[PDB]
């Protein structure tokens, strides 16, 4: 991979400060920071050579500050966060100032900043059972999973058949879709398909689970409303084969 970032995600209210960390590959001279929004390429923020910042883009406000005190790990501090900071902040590192050595990217830290945290909802998940019409026409059986209506949109959908994540027979929408699109705080929906053989579905000993990891608030966030604090969690929907 082999660069790391902490945390993977963070949801703040407007006022708050936030700090990310990035750990480069051992002895990598160079560390880069980018930010990215949906459907766009990474936008350069700043880079380091040893401990020595280098260059910061006329992007970065004074509210951003990136440190790297031992030419090793790097922290990015964003002060007094704004809605417009919401983005995936990517870390990269490189062995030497050397064209031969490539940049290795970390998995990123997805920041979402909000007018208020009552707009954050987890997904509800339903699994939809295959049509008999399909089974008799194609001798195949398509299950559909629907994730709704969550916010923000950092969810990870996965199908598990008989207790193992599967990838054969599976399709998930590249992006979610807006439920009321229409709105600033539009809550999102995502669908996925699992296709099996008719006979595989018609065996009641087979078990189908749709799992959606949602990245929400932390246990430590101030929470006000009646409904369950929409923390980082996994929501699931199950289905067994129908003997029919």
């Amino acid at each position: 991979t082999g660069v790391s970032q902490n945390p993977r995600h963070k949801i703040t209210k407007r006022g708050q400060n936030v700090t990310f960390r990035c750990d480069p590959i051992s002895e990598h001279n160079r560390l880069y920071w980018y930010r990215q929004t949906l459907g766009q390429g990474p936008e350069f923020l700043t880079y380091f050579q040893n401990e020595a910042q280098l260059e910061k883009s006329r992007l970065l406000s004074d509210r951003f500050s990136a440190e790297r005190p031992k030419g090793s790990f790097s922290t990015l501090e964003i002060q007094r966060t704004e809605q417009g900071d919401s983005a995936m902040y990517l870390c990269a590192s490189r062995y030497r100032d050397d064209s031969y050595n490539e940049q290795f990217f970390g998995p990123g830290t997805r920041l979402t900043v909000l007018e208020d945290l009552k707009n954050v909802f987890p997904p509800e998940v339903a699994v939809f059972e295959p049509s008999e019409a399909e089974i008799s026409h194609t001798q195949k059986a398509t299950l559909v999973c629907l994730a709704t209506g969550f916010y923000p949109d950092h969810v990870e959908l996965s199908w598990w058949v008989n207790g193992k994540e599967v990838h054969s027979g599976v399709c998930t929408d590249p992006q979610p879709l807006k439920e009321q699109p229409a709105l600033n705080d539009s809550r999102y929906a995502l669908s996925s398909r699992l296709r099996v053989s008719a006979t595989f579905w018609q065996n009641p000993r087979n078990h189908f689970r749709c799992q959606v990891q949602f990245y929400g608030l932390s246990e430590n966030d101030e929470w006000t409303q009646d409904r369950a604090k929409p923390v980082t969690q996994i929501v699931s929907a199950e289905a067994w084969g129908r003997a029919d």
Partner: protein, 198 residues
């Protein structure tokens, strides 16, 4: 910055897919690099280099004698290869800058059987969803302009077990009006589409 690429590009599963990049003011000492980004995830490196051709397990890279253009070759394009591909140039010391880039979509060929089926919720059970599937890859599913109705983009699955690809879009709504007979009628589904009714 110094590179230009098509925003998106279709390519046939599974011959070699050739992603082009223009860089007519390239030095000198600047290498060409290709990265790929899947979902929102970190972009992973594919291949680089100078002025020449190069190869590794993941791909091949040909750069003209001009230096002014290059081509990334993904030798046997599968569905897993569809992603965003960035072509960047760097010669040291300075920052590295990303453009746009491409949006490669591997398209499978079908021997088609288009149908729109109704699926019921597991709990529940109504709550239902409409499945438009088994259509050929020339068929496009449109976005519903009825806001209460939700139609997904089309999605290709591979049953690797049986060597069988299939396309599908999914539609749902809360309206009374809504049904599967009319869910995908705003798209231009093919004349021979199978619409069950028991």
């Amino acid at each position: 910055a110094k590179t230009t690429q098509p925003t998106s590009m279709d390519c046939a599963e599974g011959r070699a897919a050739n992603l082009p990049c223009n860089h007519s003011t390239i030095s000198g000492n600047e290498y060409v690099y290709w990265y790929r980004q899947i979902h929102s995830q970190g972009p992973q490196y594919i291949i680089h280099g100078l002025k020449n051709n190069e190869t590794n397990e993941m791909a091949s890279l040909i750069i003209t004698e001009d230096r002014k253009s290059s081509t990334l070759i993904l030798p046997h394009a599968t569905l897993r290869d569809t992603a965003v591909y960035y072509c960047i140039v760097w010669g040291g010391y300075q920052k590295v800058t990303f453009g746009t880039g491409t949006k490669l979509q591997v398209i499978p060929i079908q021997n088609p059987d288009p149908a729109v089926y109704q699926l019921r919720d597991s709990k529940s059970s109504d709550k239902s969803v409409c499945l438009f599937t088994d259509f050929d890859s020339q068929t496009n599913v449109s976005q519903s302009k009825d806001s209460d109705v939700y139609i997904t983009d089309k999605c290709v699955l591979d049953m690797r077990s049986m060597d069988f690809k299939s396309n599908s879009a999914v539609a749902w709504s809360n309206k009374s009006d809504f049904a599967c007979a009319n869910a995908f009628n705003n798209s231009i589904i093919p004349e021979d589409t199978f619409f069950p009714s028991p």
